[PDB]
Amino acid sequence: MDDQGCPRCKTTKYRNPSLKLMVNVCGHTLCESCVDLLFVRGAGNCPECGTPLRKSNFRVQLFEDPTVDKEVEIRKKVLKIYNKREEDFPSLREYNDFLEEVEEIVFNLTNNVDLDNTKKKMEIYQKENKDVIQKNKLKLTREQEELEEALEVERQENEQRRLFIQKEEQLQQILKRKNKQAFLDELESSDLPVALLLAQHKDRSTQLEMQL
Amino acid sequence: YFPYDYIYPEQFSYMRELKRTLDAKGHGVLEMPSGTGKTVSLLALIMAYQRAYPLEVTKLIYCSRTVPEIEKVIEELRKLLNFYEKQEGEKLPFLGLALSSRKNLCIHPEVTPLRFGKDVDGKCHSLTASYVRAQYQHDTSLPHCRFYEEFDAHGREVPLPAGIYNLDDLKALGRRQGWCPYFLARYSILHANVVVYSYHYLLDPKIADLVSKELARKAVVVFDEAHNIDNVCIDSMSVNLTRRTLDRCQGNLETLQKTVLRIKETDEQRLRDEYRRLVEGLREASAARETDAHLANPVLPDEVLQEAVPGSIRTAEHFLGFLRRLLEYVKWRLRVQHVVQESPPAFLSGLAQRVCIQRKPLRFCAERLRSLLHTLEITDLADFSPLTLLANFATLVSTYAKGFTIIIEPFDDRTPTIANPILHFSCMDASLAIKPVFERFQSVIITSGTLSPLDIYPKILDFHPVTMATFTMTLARVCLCPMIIGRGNDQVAISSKFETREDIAVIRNYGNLLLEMSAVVPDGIVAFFTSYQYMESTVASWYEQGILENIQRNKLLFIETQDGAETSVALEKYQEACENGRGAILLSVARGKVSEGIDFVHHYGRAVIMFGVPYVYTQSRILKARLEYLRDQFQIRENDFLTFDAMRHAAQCVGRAIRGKTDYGLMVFADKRFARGDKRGKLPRWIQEHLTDANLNLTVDEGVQVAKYFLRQMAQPFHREDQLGLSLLSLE
Numbered sequence: 001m002d003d004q005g006c007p008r009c010k011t012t013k014y015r016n017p018s019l020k021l022m023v024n025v026c027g028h029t030l031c032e033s034c035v036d037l038l039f040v041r042g043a044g045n046c047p048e049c050g051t052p053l054r055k056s057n058f059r060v061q062l063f064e065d066p067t068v069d070k071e072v073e074i075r076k077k078v079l080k081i082y083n084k085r086e087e088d089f090p091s092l093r094e095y096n097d098f099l100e101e102v103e104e105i106v107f108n109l110t111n112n113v114d115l116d117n118t119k120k121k122m123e124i125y126q127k128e129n130k131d132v133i134q135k136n137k138l139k140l141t142r143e144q145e146e147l148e149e150a151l152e153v154e155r156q157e158n159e160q161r162r163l164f165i166q167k168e169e170q171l172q173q174i175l176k177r178k179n180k181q182a183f184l185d186e187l188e189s190s191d192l193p194v195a196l197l198l199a200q201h202k203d204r205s206t207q208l209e210m211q212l
Numbered sequence: 213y214f215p216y217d218y219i220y221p222e223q224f225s226y227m228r229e230l231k232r233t234l235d236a237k238g239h240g241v242l243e244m245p246s247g248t249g250k251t252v253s254l255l256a257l258i259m260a261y262q263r264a265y266p267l268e269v270t271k272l273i274y275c276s277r278t279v280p281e282i283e284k285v286i287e288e289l290r291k292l293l294n295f296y297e298k299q300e301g302e303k304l305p306f307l308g309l310a311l312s313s314r315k316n317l318c319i320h321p322e323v324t325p326l327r328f329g330k331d332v333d334g335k336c337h338s339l340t341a342s343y344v345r346a347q348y349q350h351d352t353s354l355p356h357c358r359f360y361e362e363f364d365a366h367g368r369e370v371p372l373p374a375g376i377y378n379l380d381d382l383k384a385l386g387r388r389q390g391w392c393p394y395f396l397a398r399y400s401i402l403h404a405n406v407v408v409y410s411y412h413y414l415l416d417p418k419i420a421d422l423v424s425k426e427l428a429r430k431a432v433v434v435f436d437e438a439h440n441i442d443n444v445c446i447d448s449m450s451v452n453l454t455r456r457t458l459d460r461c462q463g464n465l466e467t468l469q470k471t472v473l474r475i476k477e478t479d480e481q482r483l484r485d486e487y488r489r490l491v492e493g494l495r496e497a498s499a500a501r502e503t504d505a506h507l508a509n510p511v512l513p514d515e516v517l518q519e520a521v522p523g524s525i526r527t528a529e530h531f532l533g534f535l536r537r538l539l540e541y542v543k544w545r546l547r548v549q550h551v552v553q554e555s556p557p558a559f560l561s562g563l564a565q566r567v568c569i570q571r572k573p574l575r576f577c578a579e580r581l582r583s584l585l586h587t588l589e590i591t592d593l594a595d596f597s598p599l600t601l602l603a604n605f606a607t608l609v610s611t612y613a614k615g616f617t618i619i620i621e622p623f624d625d626r627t628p629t630i631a632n633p634i635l636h637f638s639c640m641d642a643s644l645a646i647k648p649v650f651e652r653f654q655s656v657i658i659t660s661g662t663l664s665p666l667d668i669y670p671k672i673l674d675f676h677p678v679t680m681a682t683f684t685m686t687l688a689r690v691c692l693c694p695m696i697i698g699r700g701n702d703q704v705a706i707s708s709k710f711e712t713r714e715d716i717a718v719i720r721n722y723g724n725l726l727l728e729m730s731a732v733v734p735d736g737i738v739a740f741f742t743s744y745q746y747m748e749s750t751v752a753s754w755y756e757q758g759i760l761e762n763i764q765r766n767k768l769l770f771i772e773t774q775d776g777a778e779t780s781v782a783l784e785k786y787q788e789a790c791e792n793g794r795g796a797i798l799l800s801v802a803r804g805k806v807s808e809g810i811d812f813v814h815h816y817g818r819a820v821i822m823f824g825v826p827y828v829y830t831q832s833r834i835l836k837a838r839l840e841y842l843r844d845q846f847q848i849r850e851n852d853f854l855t856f857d858a859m860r861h862a863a864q865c866v867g868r869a870i871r872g873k874t875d876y877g878l879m880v881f882a883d884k885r886f887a888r889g890d891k892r893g894k895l896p897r898w899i900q901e902h903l904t905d906a907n908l909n910l911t912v913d914e915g916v917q918v919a920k921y922f923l924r925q926m927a928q929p930f931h932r933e934d935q936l937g938l939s940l941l942s943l944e
């Protein structure tokens with residue numbers, strides 16, 4: 001009831017309103033119920049022509065994110081080995097050459113040029129794939145250790161802060177509740193040290209610096 | 213040195229204020245009464261310090277907050293210019309530059325009378341340095357911006373202008389000699405000796421409006437009424453983002469692509485010659501008015517943009533970076549609309565998952581946004597304006613986010629549905645907005661006639677050698693009547709405990725306390741409501757239930773509108789409807805922007821009634837991060853400034869209606885919160901002799917006779933009020 005549901009039988013989107021569709025690799029429209037029937041009728045095919053697929057590659061995003069097909073292939077192609085191609089150079093480069101030459105070929109895949117095996121067969125053959133992977137292994141172990149500790153110190157401190165607020169609430173309350181209850185029985189069973197007023201002033205002056 | 217007559221024994225109270233804050237390079241905080249000629253006090257010693265080349269150097273920048281009072285500054289100092297001129301003999305050279313570029317601009321009739329400022333200045337600059345910079349020679353298309361070329365001629369030459377002009381003064385010179393307010397200003401900034409402009413214009417971090425050369429040798433800048441600096445500085449870096457904006461931006465995404473597609477090598481090889489020069493030696497392409505249409509520096513306190521040409525080598529590639537940005541940014545928007553989320557540096561981190569190359573193309577974007585349009589030099593600016601918003605944003609997200617704050621506000625604020633979600637990037641450190649100010653300056657003086665707690669300069673989080681309390685005497689009988697109400701009969705509930713719409717039983721006697729104020733007090737009253745819907749709530753019972761039945765019969769009423777157009781109307785009336793046979797009490801809002809730029813006189817406007825605690829009450833969760841950071845600064849501040857924020861706006865609004873020092877003022881206080889808060893917020897010169905001498909819980913019916921007793925006495929017997937002649941020590 002929003003775009004056209006699936007181009008298959010229209011028993012998914014017109015009947016169920018509380019479910020969204022999925023998007024294959026090349027930026028097409030397909031409902032979620034034609035995923036199960038896509039497994040016994042072709043095993044990874046785009047349901048308008050018959051384009052073959054991978055392990056279903058169904059991004060479930062109706063936020064107009066993969067509708068631009070250039071977007072979802074950046075998620076494909078940059079994250080493919082080109083992420084792994086990338087970050088070894090911002091570790092150690094000359095000054096920008098290992099950025100911008102490497103920046104150039106980003107444009108030379110997004111245009112469906114199909115000059116890629118020319119670069120895939122020179123992709124990691126000049127350098128060490130383990131040296132590539134280990135920096136991917138370095139950075140990912142770096143960043144997951146980095147993000148969790150950032151998540152913990154923002155979890156610990158404010159909770160420690162609000163508990164420090166919470167105990168100071170508990171501090172000021174029962175202090176006030178007891179020191180006057182102390183000041184209550186201060187008179188009861190004793191008419192103050194040597195005068196009507198004396199230590200009952202004395203106690204009426206000692207209890208403010210205890211909060212202060 | 214203009215003592216010029218009895219000057220209500222104050223210039224001597226401010227004489228050593230200069231000599232302490234200036235000779236010793238003191239940063240300096242001044243209390244001032246609202247009835248003290250705010251430059252006649254200040255500039256009379258400042259212009260005295262102007263001639264006093266006490267070692268060598270005396271700059272002057274000045275700013276205030278409203279352009280009519282900007283000219284009102286200029287207005288009588290011209291006689292002060294003339295004053296000692298006859299007295300010291302000859303007349304030396306001078307310049308005071310009112311530098312307006314927003315409204316006052318253009319003398320061409322095709323350009324001028326379109327209402328807004330920014331868009332029409334985009335038409336101006338698109339004509340000058342985008343059409344006549346691209347299509348240089350021509351006859352028709354090139355349009356007649358002829359006196360820019362006259363600026364070319366006399367910018368090759370050397371004239372010497374006269375004294376201080378105004379916005380309109382150069383416009384007749386525009387129709388005679390003085391050329392362009394911008395240019396006729398760029399050449400005068402070259403040898404400017406005094407600048408007056410808006411407090412806002414200096415404090416633009418979006419387009420970093422660098423006024424002078426960065427010359428902190430003795431950079432001498434003066435500040436009046438510098439109250440709501442946070443409401444400047446945080447709002448100066450506040451970034452709103454409309455969904456309607458993004459979709460319009462989404463529409464001119466591929467619109468600009470069509471310009472890319474139609475241009476094959478004409479503008480493209482123009483880039484190719486100079487994008488190579490971008491790699492070889494970094495220099496901005498334009499030094500003229502193009503930078504006015506350009507984000508000068510979104511994040512000013514940085515070192516340099518050294519490795520420009522970021523992880524982006526081509527233009528559609530750079531355009532794809534915004535396709536990588538905006539389309540992800542709505543992905544960072546549209547799903548996020550269910551939950552308000554305050555995570556400023558966590559966003560850019562999760563963005564780094566989504567954005568392929570980050571933190572350089574985040575920061576090196578807005579110029580490459582502009583520069584790849586600069587090889588075009590095609591797109592009209594108002595068309596391109598919602599885009600410059602966006603490359604400003606992630607640039608700000610790139611640099612200063614861990615001290616600052618991201619807030620996402622999709623829910624109900626004028627949208628009953630979710631029909632316009634928004635987020636905001638606020639900063640928090642107005643310090644870090646004014647730290648670069650202070651590093652660029654020498655030691656510069658705030659003066660705020662409302663600032664009673666000096667403890668809020670460390671809300672600016674800064675250091676101060678000079679911060680005292682100005683005490684003036686009153687031999688003017690009695691300066692004013694401050695009158696805290698606290699009715700006992702109708703049982704004061706004037707703070708919104710049961711809120712502005714929780715009960716109208718509270719509201720049953722604001723009319724009663726007003727009509728009797730209306731019945732007694734003549735001569736025009738300007739009162740202060742809290743907000744517009746509050747104002748809409750204020751008069752809500754007033755029509756249907758019987759309220760105005762005597763109120764319109766006594767004086768008349770001036771509604772101020774949410775729209776500033778109709779708001780300026782009653783104004784045209786109020787200056788007139790008082791000065792004829794009518795009292796005509798105006799009705800207004802404190803926090804609304806009707807409360808600046810006026811300086812009410814004894815002629816019209818001489819009384820103010822408080823209505824409620826003048827605090828914020830509106831914007832959700834802009835508090836808490838601002839709260840907790842000052843709780844990360846001083847830790848008991850929830851109670852503290854959330855009093856003073858009301859108070860710093862209160863006498864900002866309330867303490868206005870007296871100018872000289874006999875001008876009267878009936879500043880009564882209908883308030884439930886007075887016990888410490890009003891007392892802390894009122895001036896130490898003003899709590900002392902006047903506030904609650906023996907009048908606190910003053911029921912209006914009793915407080916009726918107070919103003920009666922006040923005015924009737926105060927109207928007669930005036931001749932002599934604190935007459936100073938010669939110097940007789942007195943020693944305060």
Ligand code: SF4
Nearest residue numbers: 317318319336357392
């Ligand atoms: S430059 Fe001076 S004249 Fe030419 S557009 Fe701007 S104002 Fe109008």
Ligand SMILES: [Zn+2]
Nearest residue numbers: 025026046051
């Ligand atoms: Zn395909």
Ligand SMILES: [Zn+2]
Nearest residue numbers: 006012031034
């Ligand atoms: Zn289906």
